[PDB]
Design a protein around this ligand. Structure first.
Ligand SMILES: COc1cc(S(=O)(=O)O)c2ccc3c(S(=O)(=O)O)cc(S(=O)(=O)O)c4ccc1c2c43
Ligand SMILES: [Zn+2]
Ligand SMILES: [Zn+2]
Lengths: 217, 221
């Protein structure tokens, strides 16, 4: 069956710049003078959407910043210029022979200036404490690049595990990311110690950003 | 416009079946081939098979032969896929898509809204919703981040809205993660200091799978 290999798997491009996305098929996908390769855009959360068909034809309603070239085995999707809401995964697909097959996708990331997180920390709610559980939560908001470490400290000793980190997809307007980090304890372990800290380490500073609270106030 | 509306999320036990639908509008259902496509979280797309409504004929990816079955209801412009002997391998998003172009080798010009299938033994559980507000006596500094932690529910998903959608631009939704076989997600909103707490803030959490909605007022401790 025809294998499509896209590259890169992942691509960071600045606003206003040109993105180049490749797809190579293991067999020629040409027939009757055409190249049966298509490109789709998928924004996260959403169905794919047709950008280009038969290698180079622009689907209607799709802006001319998107263009496709190539024939036989090598194909290119170009985005030019790239805009903030192009954050998506792009997929090539052949339909020259059954079964139709898809490349593994290329995830387009917008490259923008560095931005430090805004960190907020929150103790367990009295509601949760009544259940006998205890989650401490730390929001790390509007940062770039995506790469960030959160370190949890309880009275100055570091805790893993019980930590769940979860990032948003890159914002399609400001191109930043947010993260939440949740440390889950038992009500009893929670009530045993006093000081809780969420430390965010990011390339914006040689210096961790710290937020803390003391359970007894 | 051409629309393909797909049936809602489905939770199915291992070994059971599921049947899902795709309603066409804005065009002649009987005039187009309908294809189906599997997307497993949230990466690779695989073509399943196709069906001609009016007529028709159908065909499958060999990988999906034992597994999938395509049917149509022409009277009601609805295409159907049924999946049998489900494994966690079949937990995925399924799309229907219209085939365009002049031929058998056509591209897909419209995609349906996607049906999410979870294959699991874990029981439907509603979420606990806890407020996330300052704090320890003081607010700092010029903007205030509030949140709701939505915890211990199954299956996915939930929807969190803030002041019935009045807060919007500031909302961050954090994807759900599975701990101890239950889901936890959170959502934050940020408002101006000068506004809080005088202007009250409520997160509403919907878990359609358990028909439960919960509102939480973001009181200060
Ligand atoms: C010389 O044979 C041609 C020519 C064209 S052309 O319009 O671009 O000249 C075709 C244009 C489009 C074709 C299409 S498409 O509209 O679904 O992209 C499918 C097929 S197919 O091989 O019969 O499935 C074709 C089979 C043969 C085809 C063409 C298609
Ligand atoms: Zn071949
Ligand atoms: Zn944001």
């Amino acid at each position: 069956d025809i294998v499509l290999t896209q590259s890169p798997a992942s691509l960071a491009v600045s606003l206003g710049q040109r993105a180049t996305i490749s797809c190579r098929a293991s067999e020629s996908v040409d027939s009757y003078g055409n190249s049966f390769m298509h490109w789709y855009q998928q924004k996260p959360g959403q169905p794919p959407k047709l950008l280009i068909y038969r290698a180079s034809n622009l689907e209607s309603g799709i802006p001319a910043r998107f263009s496709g070239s190539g024939s036989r085995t090598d194909f290119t999707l170009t985005i030019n210029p790239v805009e903030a809401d192009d954050v998506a995964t792009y997929y090539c697909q052949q339909s020259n022979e059954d079964p139709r097959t898809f490349g593994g996708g290329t995830k387009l990331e917008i490259k923008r200036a560095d931005a430090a997180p805004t960190v907020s920390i929150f103790p367990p709610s009295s509601e949760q404490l009544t259940s006998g559980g205890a989650s401490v939560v730390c929001f790390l908001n509007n940062f770039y690049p995506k790469d960030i470490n959160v370190k949890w400290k309880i009275d100055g000793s570091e805790r893993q595990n019980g930590v769940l980190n979860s990032w948003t997809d890159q914002d399609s307007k400001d191109s930043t990311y947010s993260m939440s980090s949740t440390l889950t304890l038992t009500k009893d372990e929670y009530e045993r110690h006093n000081s809780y800290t969420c430390e965010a380490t990011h390339k914006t500073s040689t210096s961790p950003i710290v937020k803390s609270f003391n359970r007894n106030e | 416009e051409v629309q393909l509306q797909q049936s809602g999320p489905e939770l199915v036990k291992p070994g059971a079946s599921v049947k899902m639908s795709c309603k066409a509008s804005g065009y002649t259902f009987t005039d187009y081939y309908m294809h189906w496509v599997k997307q497993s979280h949230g990466k690779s797309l695989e073509w399943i098979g196709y069906i001609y409504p009016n007529n028709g004929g159908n065909g499958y990816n060999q990988k999906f032969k034992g597994k999938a079955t395509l049917t149509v209801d022409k009277s009601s412009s609805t295409a159907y896929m049924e999946l049998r002997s489900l494994t966690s391998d079949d937990s995925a998003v399924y799309y229907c898509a219209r085939r365009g172009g002049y031929g058998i080798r056509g591209y897909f010009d419209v995609w349906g809204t996607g049906t999410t299938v979870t294959v699991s033994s874990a029981k439907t559980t509603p979420p606990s919703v806890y407020p996330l507000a300052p704090g320890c006596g003081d607010t700092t500094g010029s903007s205030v981040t509030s949140g709701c932690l939505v915890k211990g529910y199954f299956p996915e998903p939930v929807t969190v809205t803030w002041n019935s959608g009045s807060l919007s631009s500031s909302v961050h939704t954090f994807p759900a993660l599975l701990q101890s076989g239950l889901y936890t997600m959170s959502s934050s909103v940020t408002v101006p200091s000068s506004t809080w707490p005088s202007q009250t803030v409520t997160c509403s959490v919907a878990h359609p799978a358990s028909s439960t909605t919960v509102d939480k007022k973001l009181e200060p401790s």
